[PDB]
Design a protein around this ligand. Structure first.
Ligand code: NI
Length: 258
């Protein structure tokens, strides 16, 4: 029926409605650190989020999105392997039912407890909708989360989850600064890939940070309290909303570091 992460509508079934699921540039992938090529020509990433305007947080039924005003060049990403300016539209997370799983990308087969995705679209295309139809239309910054120390900058997010418990619920979420979620180092891996939920379009240049951020057990615990279902429907906890690693096929993972 409609796609999800259950046994009957999970990742293994998506190909029936979205044939691109078996495409040549599907995400996520496992990052083999010994095979990634250091590429000296990659520039350092440029993250300018000081003018970021968050507006709302929403439970869309598969995750929670924090949305930003993208009507102007307020929060942009550039540099790295990118040509042009990419505007931040939203961020969200993929997480697990246990601390030993939850990330989409893996490193040398290691899975993290969660993965943060900062989604940006190429301003040359004029809007998000047009950007997803192009090979270089989006840039997603991926950050791994490991369980250890609490992340102060994530707490505001954790605290509003009770108010968007079920699908379709939203809440005003202004004045949130996404700089509080960045690790210290911007070293990264990059490869051409796709969206990880239907429609699975192959329009993403992925930028995955080598350094994870730490969150506390209690913090990740609150994520696991969300529901996939709408209000008044039987309760289904929003857990394991991650797609497993896909074949690399004809692609090279480039590293910005050695
Ligand atoms: Ni994602």
């Amino acid at each position: 029926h409609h796609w999800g992460y259950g046994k009957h509508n999970g990742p293994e079934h998506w190909h029936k409605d979205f044939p691109i699921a078996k495409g040549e540039r599907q995400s996520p992938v496992d990052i083999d650190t010994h095979t990634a090529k250091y590429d000296p020509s990659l520039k350092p990433l440029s993250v300018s989020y000081d003018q970021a305007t968050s507006l709302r947080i929403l439970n869309n039924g598969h995750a929670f999105n924090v949305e930003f005003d993208d009507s102007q060049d307020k929060a942009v990403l550039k540099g790295g392997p990118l040509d042009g300016t990419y505007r931040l539209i939203q961020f969200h997370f993929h997480w697990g039912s246990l601390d030993g799983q939850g990330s989409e990308h893996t490193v040398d087969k290691k899975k993290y407890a969660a993965e943060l995705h900062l989604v940006h679209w190429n301003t040359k295309y004029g809007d998000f909708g047009k950007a997803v139809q192009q090979p270089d239309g989006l840039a997603v910054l991926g950050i791994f989360l490991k369980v250890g120390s609490a992340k102060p900058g994530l707490q505001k997010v954790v605290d509003v989850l009770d108010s968007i418990k079920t699908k379709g619920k939203s809440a005003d979420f202004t004045n949130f600064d996404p700089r509080g979620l960045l690790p210290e180092s911007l070293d990264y891996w990059t490869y051409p890939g796709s969206l990880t939920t239907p429609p699975l379009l192959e329009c993403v240049t992925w930028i995955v940070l080598k350094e994870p951020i730490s969150v506390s057990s209690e913090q990740v615990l609150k994520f696991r309290k969300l529901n996939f279902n709408g209000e008044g429907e039987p309760e289904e906890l929003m857990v394991d909303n991650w797609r497993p690693a896909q074949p690399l096929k004809n692609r090279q993972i480039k590293a910005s570091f050695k």
